[PDB]
mmCIF file of C-alpha atoms in Angstrom:
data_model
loop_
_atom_site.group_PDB
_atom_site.id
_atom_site.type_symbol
_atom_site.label_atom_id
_atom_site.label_comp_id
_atom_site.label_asym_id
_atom_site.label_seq_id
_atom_site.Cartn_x
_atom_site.Cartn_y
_atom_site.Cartn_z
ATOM 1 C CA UNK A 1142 -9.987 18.251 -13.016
ATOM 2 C CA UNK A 1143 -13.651 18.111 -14.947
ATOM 3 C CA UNK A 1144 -14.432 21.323 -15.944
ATOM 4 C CA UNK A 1145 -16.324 23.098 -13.836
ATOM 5 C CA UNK A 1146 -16.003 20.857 -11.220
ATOM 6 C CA UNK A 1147 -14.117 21.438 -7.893
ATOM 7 C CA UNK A 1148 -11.533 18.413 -7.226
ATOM 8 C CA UNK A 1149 -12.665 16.181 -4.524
ATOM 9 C CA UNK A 1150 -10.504 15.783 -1.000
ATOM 10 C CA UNK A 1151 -8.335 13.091 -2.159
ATOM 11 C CA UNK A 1152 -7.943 14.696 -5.825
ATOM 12 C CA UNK A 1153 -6.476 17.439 -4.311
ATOM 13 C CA UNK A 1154 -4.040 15.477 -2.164
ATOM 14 C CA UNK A 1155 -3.101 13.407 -4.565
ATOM 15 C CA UNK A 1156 -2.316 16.663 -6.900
ATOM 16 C CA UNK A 1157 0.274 17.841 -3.947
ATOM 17 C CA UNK A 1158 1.358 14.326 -3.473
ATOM 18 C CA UNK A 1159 4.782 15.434 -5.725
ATOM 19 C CA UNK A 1160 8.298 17.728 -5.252
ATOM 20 C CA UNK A 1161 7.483 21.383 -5.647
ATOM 21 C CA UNK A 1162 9.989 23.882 -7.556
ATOM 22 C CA UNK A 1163 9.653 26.687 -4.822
ATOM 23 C CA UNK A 1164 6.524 27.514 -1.684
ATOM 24 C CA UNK A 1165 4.344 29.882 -3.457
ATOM 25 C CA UNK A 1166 3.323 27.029 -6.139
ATOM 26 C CA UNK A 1167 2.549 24.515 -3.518
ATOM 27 C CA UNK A 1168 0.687 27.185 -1.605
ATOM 28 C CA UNK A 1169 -1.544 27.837 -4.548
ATOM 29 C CA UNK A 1170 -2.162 24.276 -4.953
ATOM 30 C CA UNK A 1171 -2.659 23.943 -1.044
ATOM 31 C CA UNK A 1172 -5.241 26.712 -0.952
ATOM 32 C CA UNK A 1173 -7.544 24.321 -3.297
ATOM 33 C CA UNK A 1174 -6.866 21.521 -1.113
ATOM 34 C CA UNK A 1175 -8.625 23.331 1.817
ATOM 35 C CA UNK A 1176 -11.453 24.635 -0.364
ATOM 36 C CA UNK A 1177 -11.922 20.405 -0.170
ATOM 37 C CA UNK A 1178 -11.710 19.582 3.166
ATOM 38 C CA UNK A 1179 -13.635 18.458 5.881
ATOM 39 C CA UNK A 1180 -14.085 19.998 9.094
ATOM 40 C CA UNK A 1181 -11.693 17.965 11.192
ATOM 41 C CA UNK A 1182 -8.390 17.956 9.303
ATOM 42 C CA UNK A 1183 -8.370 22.075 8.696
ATOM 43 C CA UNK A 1184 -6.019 22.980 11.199
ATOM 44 C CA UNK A 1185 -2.936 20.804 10.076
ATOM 45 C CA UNK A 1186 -4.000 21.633 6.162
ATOM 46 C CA UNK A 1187 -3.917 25.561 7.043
ATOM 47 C CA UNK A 1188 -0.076 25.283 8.016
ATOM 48 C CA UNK A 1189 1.625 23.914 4.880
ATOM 49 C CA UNK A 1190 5.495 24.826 4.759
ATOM 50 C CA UNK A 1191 8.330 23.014 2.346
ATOM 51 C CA UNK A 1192 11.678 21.494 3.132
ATOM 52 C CA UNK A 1193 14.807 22.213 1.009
ATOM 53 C CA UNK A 1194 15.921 18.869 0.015
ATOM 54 C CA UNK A 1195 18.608 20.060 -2.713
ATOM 55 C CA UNK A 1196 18.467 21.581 -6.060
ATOM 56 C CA UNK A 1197 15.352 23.168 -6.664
ATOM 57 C CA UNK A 1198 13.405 20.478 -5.109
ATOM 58 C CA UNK A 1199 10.992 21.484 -2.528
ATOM 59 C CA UNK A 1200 9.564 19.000 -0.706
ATOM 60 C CA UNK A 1201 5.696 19.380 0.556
ATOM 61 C CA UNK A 1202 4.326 19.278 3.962
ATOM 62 C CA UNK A 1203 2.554 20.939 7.093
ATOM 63 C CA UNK A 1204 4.032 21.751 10.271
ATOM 64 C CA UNK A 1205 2.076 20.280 13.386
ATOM 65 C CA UNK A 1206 1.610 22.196 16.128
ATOM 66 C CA UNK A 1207 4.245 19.817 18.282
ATOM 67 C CA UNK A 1208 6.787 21.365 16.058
ATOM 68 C CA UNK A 1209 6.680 18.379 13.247
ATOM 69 C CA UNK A 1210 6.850 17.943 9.603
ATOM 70 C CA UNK A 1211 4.576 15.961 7.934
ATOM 71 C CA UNK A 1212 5.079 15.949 3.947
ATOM 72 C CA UNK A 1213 1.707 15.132 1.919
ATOM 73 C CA UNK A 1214 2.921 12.025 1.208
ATOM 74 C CA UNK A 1215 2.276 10.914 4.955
ATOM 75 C CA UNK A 1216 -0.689 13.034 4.466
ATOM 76 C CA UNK A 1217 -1.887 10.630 1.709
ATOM 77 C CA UNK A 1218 -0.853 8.047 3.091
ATOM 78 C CA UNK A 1219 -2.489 8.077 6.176
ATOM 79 C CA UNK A 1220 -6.061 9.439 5.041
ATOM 80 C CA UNK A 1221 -6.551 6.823 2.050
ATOM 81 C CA UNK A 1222 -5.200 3.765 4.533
ATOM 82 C CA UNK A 1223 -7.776 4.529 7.176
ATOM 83 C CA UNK A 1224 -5.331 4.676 9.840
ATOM 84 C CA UNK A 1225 -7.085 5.246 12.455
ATOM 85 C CA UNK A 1226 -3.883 6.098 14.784
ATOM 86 C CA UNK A 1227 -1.803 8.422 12.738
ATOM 87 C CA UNK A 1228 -4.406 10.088 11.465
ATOM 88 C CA UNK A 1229 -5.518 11.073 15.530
ATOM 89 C CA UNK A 1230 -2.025 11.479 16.023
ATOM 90 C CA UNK A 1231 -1.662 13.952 13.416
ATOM 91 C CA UNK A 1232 -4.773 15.948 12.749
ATOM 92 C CA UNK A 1233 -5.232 16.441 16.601
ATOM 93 C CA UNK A 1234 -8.145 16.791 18.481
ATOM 94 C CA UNK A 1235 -10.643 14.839 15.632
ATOM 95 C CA UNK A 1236 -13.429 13.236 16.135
ATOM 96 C CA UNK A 1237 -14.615 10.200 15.263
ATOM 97 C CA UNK A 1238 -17.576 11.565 13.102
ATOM 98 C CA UNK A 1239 -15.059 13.375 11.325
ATOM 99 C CA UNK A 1240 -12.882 10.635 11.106
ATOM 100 C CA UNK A 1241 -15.255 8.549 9.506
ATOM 101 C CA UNK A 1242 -16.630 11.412 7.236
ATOM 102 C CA UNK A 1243 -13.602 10.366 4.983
ATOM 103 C CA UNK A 1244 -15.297 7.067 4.196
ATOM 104 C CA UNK A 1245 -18.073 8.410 1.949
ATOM 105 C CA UNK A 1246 -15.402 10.748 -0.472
ATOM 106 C CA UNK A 1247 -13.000 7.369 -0.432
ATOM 107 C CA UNK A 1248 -15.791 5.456 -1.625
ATOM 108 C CA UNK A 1249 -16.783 7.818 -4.709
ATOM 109 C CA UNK A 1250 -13.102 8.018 -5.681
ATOM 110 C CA UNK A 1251 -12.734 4.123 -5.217
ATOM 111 C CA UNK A 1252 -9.681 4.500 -3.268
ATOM 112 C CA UNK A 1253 -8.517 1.364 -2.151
ATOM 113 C CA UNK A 1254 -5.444 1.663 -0.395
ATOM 114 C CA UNK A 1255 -7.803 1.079 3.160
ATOM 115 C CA UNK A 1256 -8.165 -2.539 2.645
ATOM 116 C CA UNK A 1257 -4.544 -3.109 1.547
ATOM 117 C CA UNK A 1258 -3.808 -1.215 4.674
ATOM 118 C CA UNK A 1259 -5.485 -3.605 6.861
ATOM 119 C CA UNK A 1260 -4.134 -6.626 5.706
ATOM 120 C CA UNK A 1261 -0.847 -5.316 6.048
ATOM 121 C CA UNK A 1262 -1.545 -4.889 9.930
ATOM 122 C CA UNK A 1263 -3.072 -8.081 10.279
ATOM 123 C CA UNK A 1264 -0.478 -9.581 8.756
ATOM 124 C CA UNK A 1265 1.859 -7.505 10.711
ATOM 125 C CA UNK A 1266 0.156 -8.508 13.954
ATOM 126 C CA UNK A 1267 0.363 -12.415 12.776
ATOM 127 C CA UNK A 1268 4.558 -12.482 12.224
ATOM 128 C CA UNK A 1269 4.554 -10.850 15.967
ATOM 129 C CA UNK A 1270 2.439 -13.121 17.543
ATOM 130 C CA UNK A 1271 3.130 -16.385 15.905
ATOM 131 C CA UNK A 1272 6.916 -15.698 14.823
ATOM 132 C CA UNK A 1273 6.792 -19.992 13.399
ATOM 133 C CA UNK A 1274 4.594 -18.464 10.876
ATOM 134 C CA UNK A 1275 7.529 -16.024 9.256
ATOM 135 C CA UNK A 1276 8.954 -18.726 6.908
ATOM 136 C CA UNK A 1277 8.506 -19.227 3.178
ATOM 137 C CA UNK A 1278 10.390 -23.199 2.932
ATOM 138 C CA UNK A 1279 8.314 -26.172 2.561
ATOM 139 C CA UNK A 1280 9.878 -27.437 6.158
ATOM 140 C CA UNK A 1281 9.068 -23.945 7.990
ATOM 141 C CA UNK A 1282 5.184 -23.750 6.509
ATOM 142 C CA UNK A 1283 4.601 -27.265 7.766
ATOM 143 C CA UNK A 1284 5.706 -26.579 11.296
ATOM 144 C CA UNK A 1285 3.513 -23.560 11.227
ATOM 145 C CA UNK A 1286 0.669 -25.945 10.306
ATOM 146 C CA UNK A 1287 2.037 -27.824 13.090
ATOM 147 C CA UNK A 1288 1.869 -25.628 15.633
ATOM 148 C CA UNK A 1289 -1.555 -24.479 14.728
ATOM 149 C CA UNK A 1290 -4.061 -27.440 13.879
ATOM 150 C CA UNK A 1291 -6.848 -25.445 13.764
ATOM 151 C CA UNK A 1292 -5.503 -23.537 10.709
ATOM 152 C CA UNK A 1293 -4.124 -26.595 9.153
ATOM 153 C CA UNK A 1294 -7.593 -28.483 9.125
ATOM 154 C CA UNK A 1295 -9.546 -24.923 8.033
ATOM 155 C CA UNK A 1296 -7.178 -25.346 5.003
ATOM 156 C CA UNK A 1297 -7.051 -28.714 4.311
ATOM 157 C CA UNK A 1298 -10.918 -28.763 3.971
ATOM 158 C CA UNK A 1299 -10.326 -25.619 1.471
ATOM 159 C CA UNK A 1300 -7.927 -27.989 -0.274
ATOM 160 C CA UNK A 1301 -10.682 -30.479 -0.651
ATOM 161 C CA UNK A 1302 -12.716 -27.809 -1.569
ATOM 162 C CA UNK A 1303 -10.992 -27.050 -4.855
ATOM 163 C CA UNK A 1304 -11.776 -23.479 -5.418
ATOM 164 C CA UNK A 1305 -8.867 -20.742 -5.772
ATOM 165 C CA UNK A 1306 -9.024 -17.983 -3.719
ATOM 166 C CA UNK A 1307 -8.084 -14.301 -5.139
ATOM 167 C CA UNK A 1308 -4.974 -12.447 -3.215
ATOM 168 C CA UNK A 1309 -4.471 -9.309 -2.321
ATOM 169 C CA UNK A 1310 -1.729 -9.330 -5.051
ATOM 170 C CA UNK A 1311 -4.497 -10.154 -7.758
ATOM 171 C CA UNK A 1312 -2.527 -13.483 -8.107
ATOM 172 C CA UNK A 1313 -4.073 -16.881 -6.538
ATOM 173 C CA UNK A 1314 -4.029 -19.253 -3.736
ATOM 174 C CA UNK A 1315 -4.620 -22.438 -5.626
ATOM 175 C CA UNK A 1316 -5.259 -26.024 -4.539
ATOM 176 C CA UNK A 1317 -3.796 -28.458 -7.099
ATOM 177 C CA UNK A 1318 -0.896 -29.419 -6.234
ATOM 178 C CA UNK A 1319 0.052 -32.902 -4.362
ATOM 179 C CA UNK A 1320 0.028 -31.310 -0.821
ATOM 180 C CA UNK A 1321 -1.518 -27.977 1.038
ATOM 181 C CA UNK A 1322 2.191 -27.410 2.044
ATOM 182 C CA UNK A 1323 3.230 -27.394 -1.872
ATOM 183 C CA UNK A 1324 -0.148 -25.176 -2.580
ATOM 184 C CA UNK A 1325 1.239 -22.223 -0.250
ATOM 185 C CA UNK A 1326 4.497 -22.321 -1.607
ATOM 186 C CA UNK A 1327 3.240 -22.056 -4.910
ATOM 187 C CA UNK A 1328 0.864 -19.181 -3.725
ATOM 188 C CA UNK A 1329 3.579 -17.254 -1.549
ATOM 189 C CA UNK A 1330 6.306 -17.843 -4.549
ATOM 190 C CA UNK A 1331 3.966 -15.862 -7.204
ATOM 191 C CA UNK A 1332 3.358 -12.704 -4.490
ATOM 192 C CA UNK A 1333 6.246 -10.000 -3.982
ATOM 193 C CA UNK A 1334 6.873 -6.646 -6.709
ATOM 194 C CA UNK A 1335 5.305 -4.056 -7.546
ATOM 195 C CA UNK A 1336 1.963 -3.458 -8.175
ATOM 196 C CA UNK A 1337 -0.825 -1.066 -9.836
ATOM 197 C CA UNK A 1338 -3.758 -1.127 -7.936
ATOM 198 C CA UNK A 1339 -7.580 0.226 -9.006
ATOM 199 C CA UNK A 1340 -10.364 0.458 -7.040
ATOM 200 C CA UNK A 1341 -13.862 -0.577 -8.339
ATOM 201 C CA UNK A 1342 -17.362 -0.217 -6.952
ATOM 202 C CA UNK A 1343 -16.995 1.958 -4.513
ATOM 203 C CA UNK A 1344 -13.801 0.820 -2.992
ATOM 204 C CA UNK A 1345 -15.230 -2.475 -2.424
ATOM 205 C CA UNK A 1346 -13.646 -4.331 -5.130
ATOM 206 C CA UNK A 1347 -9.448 -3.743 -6.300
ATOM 207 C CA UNK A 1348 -7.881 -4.478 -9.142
ATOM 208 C CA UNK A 1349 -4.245 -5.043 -8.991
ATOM 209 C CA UNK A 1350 -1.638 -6.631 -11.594
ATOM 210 C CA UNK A 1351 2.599 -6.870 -11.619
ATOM 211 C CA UNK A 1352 4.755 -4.015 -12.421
ATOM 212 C CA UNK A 1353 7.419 -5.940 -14.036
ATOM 213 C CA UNK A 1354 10.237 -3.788 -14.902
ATOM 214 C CA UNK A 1355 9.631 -1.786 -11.055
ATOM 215 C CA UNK A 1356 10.029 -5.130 -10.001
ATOM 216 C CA UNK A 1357 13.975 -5.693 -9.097
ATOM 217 C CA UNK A 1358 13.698 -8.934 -7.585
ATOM 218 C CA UNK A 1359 11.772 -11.722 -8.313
ATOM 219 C CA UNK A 1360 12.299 -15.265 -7.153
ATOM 220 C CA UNK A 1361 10.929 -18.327 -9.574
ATOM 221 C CA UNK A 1362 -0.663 -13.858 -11.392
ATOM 222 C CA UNK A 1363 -1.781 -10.904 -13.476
ATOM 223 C CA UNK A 1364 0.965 -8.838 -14.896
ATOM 224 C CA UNK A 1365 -0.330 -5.318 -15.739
ATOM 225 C CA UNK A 1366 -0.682 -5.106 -19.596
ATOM 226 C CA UNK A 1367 1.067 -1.499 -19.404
ATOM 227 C CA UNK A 1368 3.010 0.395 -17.814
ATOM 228 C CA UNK A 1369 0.920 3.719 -16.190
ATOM 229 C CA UNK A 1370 2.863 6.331 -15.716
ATOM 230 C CA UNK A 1371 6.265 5.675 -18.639
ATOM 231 C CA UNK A 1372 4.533 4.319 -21.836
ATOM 232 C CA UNK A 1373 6.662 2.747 -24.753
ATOM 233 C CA UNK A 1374 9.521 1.378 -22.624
ATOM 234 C CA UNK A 1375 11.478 4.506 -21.636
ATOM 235 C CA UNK A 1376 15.282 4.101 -20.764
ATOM 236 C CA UNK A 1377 13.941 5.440 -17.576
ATOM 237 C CA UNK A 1378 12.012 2.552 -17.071
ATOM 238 C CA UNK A 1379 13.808 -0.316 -18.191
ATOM 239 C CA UNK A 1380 16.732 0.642 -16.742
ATOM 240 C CA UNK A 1381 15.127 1.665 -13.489
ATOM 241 C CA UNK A 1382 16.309 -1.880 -12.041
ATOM 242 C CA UNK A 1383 19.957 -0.960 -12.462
ATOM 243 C CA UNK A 1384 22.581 -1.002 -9.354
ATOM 244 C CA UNK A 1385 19.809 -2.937 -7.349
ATOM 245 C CA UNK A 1386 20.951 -4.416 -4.460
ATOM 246 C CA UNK A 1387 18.646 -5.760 -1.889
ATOM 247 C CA UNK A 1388 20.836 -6.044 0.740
ATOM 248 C CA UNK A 1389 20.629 -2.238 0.677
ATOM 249 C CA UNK A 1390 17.337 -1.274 -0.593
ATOM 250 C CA UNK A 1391 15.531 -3.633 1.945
ATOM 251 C CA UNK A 1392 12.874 -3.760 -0.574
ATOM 252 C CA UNK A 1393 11.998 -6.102 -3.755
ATOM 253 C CA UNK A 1394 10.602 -3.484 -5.795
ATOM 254 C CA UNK A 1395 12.180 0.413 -7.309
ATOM 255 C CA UNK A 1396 9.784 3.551 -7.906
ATOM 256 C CA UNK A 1397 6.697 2.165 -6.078
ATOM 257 C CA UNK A 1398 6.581 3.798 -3.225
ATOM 258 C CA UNK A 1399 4.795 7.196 -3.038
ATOM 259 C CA UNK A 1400 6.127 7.658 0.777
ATOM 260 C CA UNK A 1401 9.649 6.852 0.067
ATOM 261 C CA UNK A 1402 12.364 9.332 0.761
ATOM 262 C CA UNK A 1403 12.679 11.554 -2.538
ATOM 263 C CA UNK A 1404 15.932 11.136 -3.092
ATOM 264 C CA UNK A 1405 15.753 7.156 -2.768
ATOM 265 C CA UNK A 1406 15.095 4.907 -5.934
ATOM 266 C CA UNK A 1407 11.929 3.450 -3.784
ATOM 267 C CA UNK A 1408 10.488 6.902 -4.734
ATOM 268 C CA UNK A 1409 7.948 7.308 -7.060
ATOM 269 C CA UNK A 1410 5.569 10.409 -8.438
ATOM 270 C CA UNK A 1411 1.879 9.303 -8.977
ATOM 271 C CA UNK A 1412 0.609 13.202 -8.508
ATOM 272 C CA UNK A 1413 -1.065 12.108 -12.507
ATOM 273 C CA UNK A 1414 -2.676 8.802 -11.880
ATOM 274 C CA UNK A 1415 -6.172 9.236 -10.530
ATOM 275 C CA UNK A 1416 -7.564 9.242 -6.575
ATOM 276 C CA UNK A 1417 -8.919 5.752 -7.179
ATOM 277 C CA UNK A 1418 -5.756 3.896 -8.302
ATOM 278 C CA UNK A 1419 -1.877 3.896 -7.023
ATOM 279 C CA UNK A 1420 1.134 1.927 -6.829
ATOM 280 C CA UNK A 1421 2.645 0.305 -3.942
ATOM 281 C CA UNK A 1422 5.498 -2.336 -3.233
ATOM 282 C CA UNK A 1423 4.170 -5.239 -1.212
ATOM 283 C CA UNK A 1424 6.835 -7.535 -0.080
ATOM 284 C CA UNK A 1425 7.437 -11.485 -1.178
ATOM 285 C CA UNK A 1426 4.597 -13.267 1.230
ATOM 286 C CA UNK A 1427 6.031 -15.035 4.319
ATOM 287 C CA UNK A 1428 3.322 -17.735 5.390
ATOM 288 C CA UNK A 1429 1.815 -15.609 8.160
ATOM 289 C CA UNK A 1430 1.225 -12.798 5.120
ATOM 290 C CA UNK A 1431 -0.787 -15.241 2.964
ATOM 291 C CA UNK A 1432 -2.926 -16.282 6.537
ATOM 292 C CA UNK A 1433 -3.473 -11.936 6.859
ATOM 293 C CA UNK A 1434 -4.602 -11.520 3.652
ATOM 294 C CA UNK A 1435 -7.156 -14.519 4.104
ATOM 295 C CA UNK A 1436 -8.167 -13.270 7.081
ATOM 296 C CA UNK A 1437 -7.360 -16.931 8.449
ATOM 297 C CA UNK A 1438 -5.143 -15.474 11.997
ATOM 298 C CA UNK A 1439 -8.324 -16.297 14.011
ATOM 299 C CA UNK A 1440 -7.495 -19.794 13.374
ATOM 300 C CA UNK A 1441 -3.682 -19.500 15.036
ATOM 301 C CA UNK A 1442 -3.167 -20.310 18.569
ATOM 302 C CA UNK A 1443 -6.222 -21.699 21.289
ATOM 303 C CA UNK A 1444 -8.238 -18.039 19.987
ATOM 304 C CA UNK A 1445 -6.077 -15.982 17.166
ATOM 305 C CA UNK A 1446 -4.959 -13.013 17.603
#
């Protein structure tokens, strides 16, 4: 908080974005959130409550008016993605000006979990509609070129091209290896862990690098020159990896997930980093996740998507 100053929207919900050690302080902390916020999200904001999830860990949240709890991690989650949806289906009755007044307080405070956001849907959208294009082998990327000529010429003429294209992961899509097949799996193979993420001019531009020791599993790119919330290699940290198992955890990546369940070792507290930066997981990249974050799925099928 700058002196003076009153914390923007999302400073505010990323202060709450934590485990609280009883009501009354996240209350207090609550009460500045709403001296931030705009005129359509008041009504869920003004009924925050806190679940008991052992010891004296209190959970944060608001009860909506269907008799739900949403914790201000779903909060933040939902407000900094842009999602559209869940944020009508939570903050009720908002319009679309309000909606869209978020867009002008993401931008100062260069959050840029919106565009990571819609990727992921996209890419979601791609492995449901054109299931040949969930592989990452050699033999399943080249029947997904197969079965979709338009892509595989768009790309081969990138190929020929020469020039690497930036990912989502701040790693690259590079083309010089014998064959476009051999350039994706080299480009899907270096995606997957976990990942600190900045936003820059206004949201328009990220910054993201590799989390290595949050990263559990990593099949043989910018890693992130320090770690930025456990400095000096804690135990903590580099033995956060510990007991992994995949089969399990579902995930590749430990303490990177601010909307994890608490008491899960996805969960991570990023209540300290600043609005415009966060961490996040994101997943090893199937073939129809490196055509999302291109925004190439207009090139699948007879029309795309």
């Amino acid at each position: 908080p700058w002196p003076g100053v009153p914390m923007s929207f999302f400073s505010n919900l990323r202060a709450v974005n934590k485990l609280y050690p009883n009501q009354a302080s996240f209350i207090t902390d609550n009460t500045r959130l709403l001296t931030s916020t705009p005129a359509g999200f008041t009504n869920v904001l003004n009924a925050p409550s806190v679940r008991n999830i052992g010891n004296n860990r209190f959970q944060p949240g608001y009860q909506l008016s269907n008799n739900q709890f949403v914790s201000t991690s779903d909060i933040n989650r939902i407000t900094r993605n842009n999602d559209v949806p869940n944020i009508r289906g939570v903050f009720q009755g908002i319009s679309d000006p309000q909606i869209n007044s978020l867009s002008q307080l993401r931008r100062v405070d260069n959050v840029p979990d919106f565009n990571y956001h819609t990727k992921q849907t996209r890419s979601n959208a791609v492995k449901q509609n054109f299931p040949e294009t969930n592989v990452r082998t050699p033999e399943g990327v080249q029947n997904a070129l197969q079965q979709n000529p338009r892509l595989h010429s768009y790309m081969q003429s990138l190929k020929v091209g020469g020039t690497g294209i930036l990912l989502a992961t701040g790693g690259y899509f590079l083309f010089s290896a014998a064959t476009l097949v051999q350039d994706i799996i080299n480009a899907i193979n270096n995606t997957g862990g976990s990942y600190y993420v900045q936003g820059k001019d206004a949201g328009e531009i990220a910054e993201a690098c590799l989390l290595l020791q949050r990263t559990c599993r990593q099949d043989p790119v910018t890693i992130c020159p320090f770690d930025p919330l456990l400095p000096n290699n804690p135990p903590e940290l580099t033995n956060m990896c510990q007991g992994f198992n995949y089969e399990v955890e579902k995930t590749v990546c430990r303490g990177s997930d601010p909307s994890a369940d608490p008491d899960s070792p996805q969960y991570v507290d990023i209540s300290d980093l600043p609005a415009g930066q966060t961490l996040m997981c994101i997943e090893p990249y199937s073939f129809g996740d490196l055509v999302g974050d291109l925004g190439l799925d207009w090139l699948l099928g007879d029309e795309g998507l």
